[PDB]
Design a protein around this ligand. Sequence first.
Ligand SMILES: N[C@@H](CC(=O)O)C(=O)O
Lengths: 427, 427, 426
Amino acid sequence: SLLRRYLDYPVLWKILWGLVLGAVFGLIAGHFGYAGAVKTYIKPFGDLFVRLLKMLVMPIVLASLVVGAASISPARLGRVGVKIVVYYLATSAMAVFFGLIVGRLFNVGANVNLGSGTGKAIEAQPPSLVQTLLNIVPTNPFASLAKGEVLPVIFFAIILGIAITYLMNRNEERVRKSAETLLRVFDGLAEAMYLIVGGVMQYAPIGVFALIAYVMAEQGVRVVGPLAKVVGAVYTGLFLQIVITYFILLKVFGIDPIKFIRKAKDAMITAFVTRSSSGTLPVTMRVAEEEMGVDKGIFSFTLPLGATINMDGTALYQGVTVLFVANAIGHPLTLGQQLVVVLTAVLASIGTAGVPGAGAIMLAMVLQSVGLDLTPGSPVALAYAMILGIDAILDMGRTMVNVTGDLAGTVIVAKTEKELDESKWIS
Amino acid sequence: SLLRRYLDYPVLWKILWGLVLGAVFGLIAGHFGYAGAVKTYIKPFGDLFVRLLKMLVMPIVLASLVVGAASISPARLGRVGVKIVVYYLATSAMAVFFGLIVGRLFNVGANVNLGSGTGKAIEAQPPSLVQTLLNIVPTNPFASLAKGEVLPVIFFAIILGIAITYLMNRNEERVRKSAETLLRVFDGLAEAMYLIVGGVMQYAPIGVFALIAYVMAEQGVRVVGPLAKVVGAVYTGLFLQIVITYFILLKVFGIDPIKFIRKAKDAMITAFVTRSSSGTLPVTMRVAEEEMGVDKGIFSFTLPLGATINMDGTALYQGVTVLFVANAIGHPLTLGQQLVVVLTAVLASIGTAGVPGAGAIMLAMVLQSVGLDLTPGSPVALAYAMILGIDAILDMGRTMVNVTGDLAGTVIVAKTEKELDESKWIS
Amino acid sequence: LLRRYLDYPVLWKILWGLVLGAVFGLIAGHFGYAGAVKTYIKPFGDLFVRLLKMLVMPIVLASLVVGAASISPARLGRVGVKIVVYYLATSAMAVFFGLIVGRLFNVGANVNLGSGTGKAIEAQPPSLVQTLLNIVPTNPFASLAKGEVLPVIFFAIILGIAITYLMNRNEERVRKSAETLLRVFDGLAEAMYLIVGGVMQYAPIGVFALIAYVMAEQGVRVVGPLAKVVGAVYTGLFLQIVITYFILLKVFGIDPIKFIRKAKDAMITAFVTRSSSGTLPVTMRVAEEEMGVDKGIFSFTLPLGATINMDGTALYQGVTVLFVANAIGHPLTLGQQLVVVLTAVLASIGTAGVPGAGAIMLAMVLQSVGLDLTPGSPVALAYAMILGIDAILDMGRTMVNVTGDLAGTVIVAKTEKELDESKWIS
Ligand SMILES: N[C@@H](CC(=O)O)C(=O)O
């Protein structure tokens, strides 16, 4: 059938085709003179998609974060455990930092010009940095769920997950079963949200097509050029991410980085082509075993984690594309909420979906966190539509660096613990 | 036994007693000089009742909708399943349409002097129709739970129910277990709220008596006339719905409706007398099997379901008694809300208990859905009290189409696949 | 330091942090950098206060649903009525003690803030009927998302009762569903207690900062017409600990000096952390293994009394309203002081168990008279002189908010004979 074939095409290439068809439809609707004809009939689908996607930020944040932070914690993390979780969070932070640096350096979204004048958010007195830190702990977690605050809910969710996993070890049975049932509730909620995200991203082709037809018909923006600069900035950012972060870490931890790249090439290409991080886990394991020298005790637990919480390419994408959305609507980010992006792109990666749409939802999450809202109609929705349309071209490098990150963390861990076979690094 | 005889007197027949006693007490203490004293001493009980009745709407709507959606989702509906569920939803929508039609024909609440002269004219300028349909989708489900928006919560709850059952049909045992646990959480919450609704409806005679005593002894408004109009508008609505909707909907399927009613009379009058749509399930099943000729597999699946999600009588009762409120208080309904009422009534009939007093919780929910809040002390509360008072005269009759629309759709679906042996519908 | 600061017992590592904070605030706010503790140190105190406020709504929703769902309604009614009568009696007696000590010390005596006649003579807004109605929430989620503890307490109790009715049903489906919902709420309460036990490990630094900022800014500003209120309020608290509670226990055959000797831990855990709903685990570990109260009694009367039983906030909301009305230039009326028995109790019931929640609700208990800030009425002078001295009054008046919880739980558990009388024998 037609609708049954529409749900079979690869969802990200469907979204990219939606963006392209939306751009051409808008150019035509300008070439003909039917601006209102698409602003009244084609826009409602765009607003429907924007709302249908912005609905899925708070439930995912809460449930996914609770489950993810209950999966890793000082309770069930041993010696390899904390030494790899510290590494994952540190390298995700450096990845978001490289994202923001390379965004400002490529001047992302500086020449799209779809804002609403130098205003509509005028404050002239931003909050201090220490206050921006204290605002992470919420005075009332339910009021921080209702008011749509993302970072306080992330903090409370992580704390609740750690507390539950502390409970699961207690010597009583009532507390153990209570903690198990609470974690199962949050697991069910997070996975139901992943199904609904699958459905919303199935719809997303039409949503992006509408939000691009409306913007290309109503006014004239630059969506053929700044998207090229975002692709260039993302890929140069991932290149720099590797050849700086992982190279300085390997050099400072005794490993020879040229050898690491020459051996990790197999998992890198496999994830680049296959385009999936959790689907290239066997090949990553095979490379870490037969090529690096990591023992089974270190990479039978690190890689199944580094394929779930070490999202470096996704973090750098959430850096540079947040910066594109911010410079696009004309509200550049200050050095006080350029760190909120880091915090809620590192913590929000501690629990991440594997479904197609784990970058877009997290980008909407970082947008709602840093202070830009996705209300239907605001140019934030239009710039997010352009980024979501380009998504299918960034996913490849995203997953390549995603699987190079944990493959470079396993080698470091197994070397620091003297459980790395030195015989597989020389001759 | 000082309370037990009161608590055991059949509710909905102590509510009508509360209404009549309130009317007569407001009469005898209205032209005796005690209006201030009845507002200071008696009306606080009606205030407490209105607060206790608003306390239930959000938890009951969220939990009941989630469980009902997960009960009739497309993940478990077969062929007869969809063929009967699209019927159960279309007939409820047409039933509320007939309710609005017949409630604007009789001018249900036109001769009631609630509210004030005009109040304010700025209350106009509603959002467009398509903007309402987009406002069905919530930007934040927790923010729609807090702000008391009962239609977006309905949508999110239906979505979450369908997601939870699509989970329960998954292969991974961990996620199936998590989905079962989440569904049992929502089931337990819905059942606890049904218990609380039972308690509140046990208290409701005092609340209706107090509100009626206050409104009578204060403004001596019409309570006999307009209630004799709404009881009669609802009954003409029911009669018209049977004789029009079910007759055309049986005749367009080759089923002669005359003999349909002639052989459904037994179940009809049994549900009319017993005032229970669930307590007439044995008679409904025997009359669908023997006297009508429907195969076993169909009426063993559509009657136990239709007695819970197909309420074409309370749908029409809400469609008429929300016109009653919106015409008595002095805020006539706009076409942008004569559709919110339909969607809310239809999607709220999807999960209902049948507990005596759950046809008025749906009315409170529909009121909170169109905009008319039950603000305590405001004319919406007094009009809703006058409606809830006459909940026996309406119940005896609207418990009959509730189960006529069950064996009127079972026969349709049995005919649509040749399980309805025409040896019974001949001569 | 490795695992050292995390394995020193919490009581005398919060008390030590408080002592170090007092001495540091003094020697650094009297001698050298007195404005650096506002930039570098006070933010840690703010982090601690926000962490304490984070754990009030879930700890009063879940720990009340699983509290009221563990008592059969037959005993729940009796315990609830007994404990509500007790809380209200102690509150209406604490306000009276506050009034008599505020008229005894003559608080706000040598302050003439420039008022001619003073508008504090007709201050009778409240009705108590709309107040008894506001207990019932019109929306439970909207009363959770707004930090209202009384409506959510009502809903949590009426939900625990519904659950303990459901677990006696014939349908095994609804039986299992109610048990699963009860397990969710029990797990939420237990996780909240673990989070509180983890926050009390940061509590040394938080108390250090919160008291360093005060003992640096108000190191010398507790002399003059202000010391008297700190000398009155505290005396008030002393009387409340010594006259009311003791006598109450002396009526029910419960040794008072032993009661204090046993509640020492909860007293010094609420006096330094300033929150009566963040010392709830330390109060439960005192009522169960040192007092001898059956779990069904305290598991409900402690999460309830942690918020609605404040016999110190009331005794503080009497002396301080009397002070802010005496600094205007006219004492409190003999008949107007009786509404303080009703407006400082109805404000000591909705007030949340968080630090510095007495000075905030003091604005509401002053809205009974409702004066404006700058001109003609020094209600933001004789209340800016109090908010600056709050974190000292907000330490003793939250020691009695948990001694009241413990005394009421001991009374209710001894009247119902569910108290283990093998503990008070020595
Ligand atoms: N912090 C106090 C409340 C207050 O003083 O306002 C307590 O809960 O004990």
